[PDB]
């Protein structure tokens, strides 16, 4: 085993990168996640759409919302949005389910905010996340608010423990009904976002259910390049990895490679154990 050598390997991957790199790793034999930079508040960027989806699907389970329930999107009434690119015309209707797909799989910002409008907004998400017993995270703002002043993304933050905690609650399947859980997983697996992030240095065909977050480049700097998710090991057990690269001065590809490298470290460590029976 030697878990401290796993942490050693990750420190050596991060050291002397011009960024603050938060890490959580939670292997299937670990009672606790390995954390790197456990004191820092990491801007979640779109990683919070995973949280939001959990809130939405919970309310679906409660009969407060319906998956086919419909939402009138008016173009003159409402940023990154495949949903707006996909639909023609000034007004159209989308099912909640479609809103979730756009939000979780495509990081659609408009779909996200429309989902906020249904559940009681950012503070409702905030209180949801606390309800799960996850203390070290905050949601104060929706996507439109973050687009208005890019200091605002720092107000939507998680610690690495809280990143780990939300991935466990997701992976363990106890928060949602079977139908809701299966859908969230599907959206998170079938996303094409961040192919170079947790998946980047894994074997092709490795199942990774994950959610990205990426701020724009401002001031030569990148506030958040994130990826959190569940990697399926070749014994079919889960490996939770979250890597948040914050306030980085490094190239986009470097930021992404940091994530790939850490995730490959954790995965290979897990492979090595399996290799030895």
Automatic annotation (TrEMBL):
Record-listed E.C. numbers: 3.5.2.6
EC class: hydrolase
Keywords: Antibiotic resistance, Hydrolase, Plasmid, Signal
Catalytic activity: a beta-lactam + H2O = a substituted beta-amino acid
Highest rank taxon of the organism: Bacteria
Pfam families: Beta-lactamase2
Gene Ontology MF annotations: beta-lactamase activity
Domain Beta-lactamase class A catalytic: 23-245
Gene3D superfamilies tied to this protein: DD-peptidase/beta-lactamase superfamily (3.40.710.10)
Example GO biological process: response to antibiotic
SUPFAM superfamilies on file: beta-lactamase/transpeptidase-like
Annotated family: Belongs to the class-A beta-lactamase family.
Name of the protein in question: Beta-lactamase
Gene from which this protein is expressed: blaPER-2
């Amino acid at each position: 085993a030697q878990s401290p050598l796993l942490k050693e390997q990750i420190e050596t991957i991060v050291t002397g990168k011009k960024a603050t790199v938060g890490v959580a790793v939670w292997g299937p034999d670990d009672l606790e996640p390995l954390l790197l930079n456990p004191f820092e508040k990491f801007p979640m960027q779109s990683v919070f759409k995973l949280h939001l989806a959990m809130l939405v699907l919970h309310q679906v389970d409660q009969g407060k919302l319906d998956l086919n329930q419909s939402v009138t999107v008016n173009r003159a009434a409402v940023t990154w949005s495949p949903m707006m690119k996909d639909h023609q015309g000034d007004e159209f209707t989308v099912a909640v389910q479609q809103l979730l797909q756009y939000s979780v799989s495509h990081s659609d910002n408009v779909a996200c905010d429309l989902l906020f409008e249904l559940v009681g907004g950012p503070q409702a998400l905030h209180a949801y996340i606390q309800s799960l017993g996850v203390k070290e995270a905050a949601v104060v703002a929706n996507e439109a608010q973050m687009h208005a002043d890019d200091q605002v993304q720092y107000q939507n933050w998680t610690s690495m423990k809280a990143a780990a905690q939300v991935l466990q609650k997701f992976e363990q399947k106890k928060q949602l009904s079977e139908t809701s859980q299966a859908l969230l997983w599907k959206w998170m697996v079938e996303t094409t976002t961040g192919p170079q992030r947790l998946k980047g240095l894994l074997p092709a065909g490795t199942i990774v259910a994950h959610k990205t977050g990426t701020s724009g480049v401002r001031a030569g700097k990148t506030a958040a390049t994130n990826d959190a998710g569940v990697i399926m090991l070749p014994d079919g057990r889960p490996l939770l990895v979250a890597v948040f690269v914050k306030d980085s001065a490094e190239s986009e590809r470097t930021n992404e490679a940091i994530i790939a490298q850490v995730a490959q470290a954790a995965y290979q460590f897990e492979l090595k154990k399996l290799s030895a029976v």
